[PDB]
């Protein structure tokens, strides 16, 4: 998975 929280 690809997960991002900016």
Author numbering: 1 to 6
The authors write:
Crystals of APRGLP1 grew only at a low pH (pH ≈ 2, T = 37 °C) where the N-terminal glutamic acid self-converted to a pyroglutamic acid (pE) via a spontaneous ring closure. In the structure of APRGLP1 the hydrophobic residues (Phe, Ile, Ala, Leu) form a hydrophobic core, while Trp and pGlu participate in H-bonding with each other and water molecules. In the crystal structure of pEFIAWL, the ring-closure of an N-terminal Glu residue (resulting in the formation of pyroglutamic acid) makes the N-terminal more hydrophobic by eliminating the charge frustrations linked to both the Glu side chain and the protonated N-terminal amine. The crystal structure of APRGLP1 provide an example where pyroglutamic acid built in a β-spine amyloid nanostructure can be studied. Based on our current results, we propose that the elimination of the charges by ring closure, significantly contributes to self-assembly, compared to sole side chain protonation of Glu. This might also be the reason why we observed the presence of pEFIAWL in the crystal state while the parent hexapeptide, EFIAWL, did not crystallize despite forming amyloid. The five-membered ring structure of pGlu shows similar geometry to that of Pro, which is considered a formidable β-sheet breaker. Thus, cyclic pGlu with quasi-fixed dihedrals would be expected to function as a gatekeeper of amyloid formation by twisting the backbone structures away from that of typical β-strands. However, the example of the crystal structure of pEFIAWL provides compelling evidence that a Pro-like residue right next to an APR does not necessarily prevent β-stranded amyloid formation. The glucagon-like APRs (APRGLP2 and APRGLP1) show an extensive contact surface (Sc = ~0.80; Area = ~160 Å2) along the extended, linear backbone of high complementarity, while exendin-like sequences (APRex-4 and APRTc5b) present generally smaller values (Sc = ~0.65; Area = ~110 Å2).
